[PDB]
């Protein structure tokens, strides 16, 4: 079942701000890194917030307070690195916070060239291994520009990404397959979900998906590995008041989740359950979905009091407690109950059957309408 | 001569994506047309 | 880079190992290689920079207060000259550790993390040890 486990709310510097990015620390699962909005209300006050909070003490204040200049778009740990927070503007540029440095001001940035990111950054990514790994970012012009974590003056590849006729796609998500480092996938805001490749003969976008009539929110792929592989599966929210369920290899949607009376903004696979991922809305009702118990309605489903707009939806790693932001800087920590959770040993076969039966129910759904 | 030689440059990437997508949907026009004909 | 990954098997002092790092500079262009070599640049970075600071506590006391004016003196080295020949070098044992942190970060250096402040350091260093006014002074 769903339940409150913690609420987090700074009053200095969450207040009048709206939740931007959320992501917990691989190494460190009990530390969350919250981005934030620019506050109209307070002009002299730093525009860009990003506080990180820490789920094993009890306390109310944050752990660590970060602020830029400009307004924080999407921020994130780094995965290889302990110490650092990896954080993208609304300006462009990829500001490197740091916690042994006695200064809330970011200790690198990017330049604002040709050569780096000008438009607004909405997804920043850290892919690879411990001894080989770089950082990732694509802007909403469509740039994408591979950083080393400390050459952070000019990036080592650099492209542009067109899908036809030269034109700049408008990316506002990015999701990456799980141990992949060189395929992944993007979500423009026009409502064409597109593949990509980083690096190779053929770089830039592969495949094309229509789908959607609205501007991609967000976009992930599935995380949980078990006995039968999923690494070509991923969902996509978008502003047409639809998620829709998608592969790598059928170029149509596999499923369309209209039940949802409102826009919808976040989605993203659980990393342990392998059918389960959780979505919000506008009104503040947090929605699960389980595809091996039902494929209509929500499993379980809670609303945070206010009815705030829910921007933002974080799963930790054990898959047990998820975050969730807002409008208001309300961050709400809701843990899961186990029984929704905890997946059984057949649970990647019954997902199998699942996908199996919903592939031939809706190839059999339009011929017999057409015929 | 470094900004006339990145000026060039652009010039050109204008003046081969007008021949691309000048060429492919010409032939998308006909297409559509020759189909409206019949 | 197994082969480059025994260093602390062989190299027990940081002397040879930046000997070491020297000669098998160029393999470092490589970015999978630049990547494999992360925690023994830290330590290096840091002896750098303890020698940097030994250096300005080196040139915290003056040329008048140092023995080597007093060694000078007794080898028929006139002041004036003798502060010229040890200001530079001192500036040559500056120069010597700018090419050892070139080394051992490699090409970029100036733009790096740890190279920055280090660049910068040597920049306003090396402006406060030129000899050209005392030059000028002793010539008037």
């Given amino acids: 079942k769903l339940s409150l486990n913690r609420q987090f709310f700074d009053e200095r510097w969450s207040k009048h701000r709206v939740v931007s990015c959320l992501d917990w620390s691989s190494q460190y699962p009990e530390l969350l890194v919250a981005s934030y909005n620019n506050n109209?209300?307070?002009?002299?006050?730093?525009?860009?917030?990003?506080?990180?909070?820490?789920?094993?003490?009890?306390?109310?204040?944050?752990?660590?307070?970060?602020?830029?200049?400009?307004?924080?778009?999407?921020?994130?740990?780094?995965?290889?690195?302990?110490?650092?927070?990896?954080?993208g503007t609304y300006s462009g540029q990829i500001v490197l916070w740091d916690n042994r440095s006695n200064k809330r001001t970011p200790v690198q940035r990017t330049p604002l060239s040709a050569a780096a990111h000008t438009h607004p950054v909405y997804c920043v990514n850290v892919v690879g291994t411990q001894n080989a790994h770089n950082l990732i970012s694509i802007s909403t012009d469509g740039k994408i520009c591979s950083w080393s974590l400390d050459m952070l003056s000019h990036p080592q590849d650099s492209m542009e990404l067109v899908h036809k006729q030269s034109k700049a796609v408008a990316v506002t998500s990015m999701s990456f397959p799980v141990g992949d480092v060189n395929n992944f996938v993007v979500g423009s805001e026009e409502g064409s979900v597109y593949?990509?490749?980083?690096?190779?003969?053929?770089?830039?976008?592969?495949?094309?998906?229509?789908?959607?009539?609205?501007?991609?929110?967000?976009?992930?792929?599935?995380?949980?590995?078990?006995?039968?592989?999923?690494?070509?599966?991923?969902?996509?929210?978008?502003?047409?008041?639809?998620?829709?369920?998608?592969?790598?290899?059928?170029?149509?949607?596999?499923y369309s989740f209209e039940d949802n009376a409102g826009y919808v903004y976040d989605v993203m696979w659980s990393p342990t359950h392998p059918a389960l991922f959780a979505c919000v809305d506008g009104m503040g009702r947090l929605d699960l979905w389980n595809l091996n118990n039902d494929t209509e309605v929500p499993t379980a489903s809670i609303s945070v009091e206010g009815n705030p707009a829910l921007n933002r939806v974080r799963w930790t790693h054990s898959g047990r407690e998820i975050a969730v932001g807002d409008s208001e800087g309300?961050?709400?920590?809701?843990?899961?109950?186990?029984?929704?959770?905890?997946?059984?040993?057949?649970?990647?076969?019954?997902?199998?059957?699942?996908?199996?039966?919903?592939?031939?129910?809706?190839?059999?759904?339009?011929?017999?309408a057409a015929t | 001569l470094t900004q006339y030689e990145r000026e060039k440059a652009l010039r050109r990437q204008a003046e081969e994506k007008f021949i691309e997508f000048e060429d492919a949907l010409e032939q998308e026009k006909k297409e559509l047309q020759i189909q409206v004909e019949h | 880079?197994?082969?480059?990954?025994?260093?602390?098997?062989?190299?027990?002092?940081?002397?040879?190992?930046?000997?070491?790092?020297?000669?098998?500079?160029?393999?470092?262009?490589?970015?999978?290689?630049?990547?494999?070599?992360?925690?023994?640049?830290?330590?290096?970075?840091?002896?750098?920079?303890?020698?940097?600071?030994?250096?300005?506590?080196?040139f915290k006391?003056?040329?008048?207060?140092?023995?080597?004016?007093?060694?000078?003196?007794?080898?028929?080295?006139?002041?004036?000259?003798?502060?010229?020949?040890?200001?530079?070098?001192?500036?040559?044992?500056?120069?010597?550790?700018?090419?050892?942190?070139?080394?051992?970060?490699?090409?970029?250096?100036?733009?790096?993390?740890?190279?920055?402040?280090?660049?910068?350091?040597?920049?306003?260093?090396?402006?406060?040890?030129?000899?050209?006014?005392i030059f000028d002074d002793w010539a008037r």
């Avoid at chain 1, 190779?200 to 501007?215: D, L, N, T, V």
């Avoid at chain 1, 809701?334 to 190839?363: C, H, K, M, S």
């Avoid at chain 3, 990547?35 to 002896?47: M, S």
Wanted: with cysteine.
């Fill in chain 1, 330 to 368: 309300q961050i709400v920590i809701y843990d899961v109950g186990e029984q929704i959770a905890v997946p059984r040993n057949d649970e990647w076969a019954r997902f199998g059957r699942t996908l199996a039966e919903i592939n031939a129910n809706r190839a059999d759904a339009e011929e017999e």
């Fill in chain 1, 40 to 87: 109209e209300d307070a002009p002299h006050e730093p525009d860009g917030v990003a506080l990180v909070w820490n789920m094993k003490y009890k306390k109310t204040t944050p752990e660590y307070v970060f602020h830029c200049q400009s307004a924080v778009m999407s921020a994130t740990f780094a995965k290889f690195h302990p110490n650092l927070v990896v954080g």
């Fill in chain 1, 195 to 254: 593949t990509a490749c980083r690096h190779g003969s053929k770089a830039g976008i592969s495949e094309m998906f229509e789908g959607h009539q609205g501007p991609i929110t967000g976009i992930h792929c599935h995380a949980a590995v078990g006995a039968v592989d999923f690494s070509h599966l991923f969902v996509t929210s978008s502003f047409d008041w639809t998620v829709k369920l998608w592969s790598t290899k059928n170029n149509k949607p596999l």
């Fill in chain 3, 61 to 133: 006391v003056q040329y008048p207060q140092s023995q080597a004016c007093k060694m000078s003196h007794v080898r028929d080295l006139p002041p004036v000259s003798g502060s010229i020949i040890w200001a530079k070098q001192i500036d040559r044992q500056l120069t010597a550790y700018m090419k050892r942190v070139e080394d051992v970060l490699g090409k970029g250096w100036e733009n790096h993390v740890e190279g920055q402040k280090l660049k910068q350091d040597g920049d306003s260093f090396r402006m406060k040890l030129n000899t050209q006014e």
């Fill in chain 3, 1 to 58: 880079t197994a082969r480059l990954r025994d260093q602390l098997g062989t190299a027990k002092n940081a002397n040879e190992m930046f000997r070491i790092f020297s000669r098998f500079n160029a393999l470092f262009v490589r970015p999978h290689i630049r990547g494999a070599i992360r925690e023994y640049q830290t330590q290096l970075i840091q002896r750098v920079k303890d020698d940097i600071e030994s250096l300005h506590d080196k």
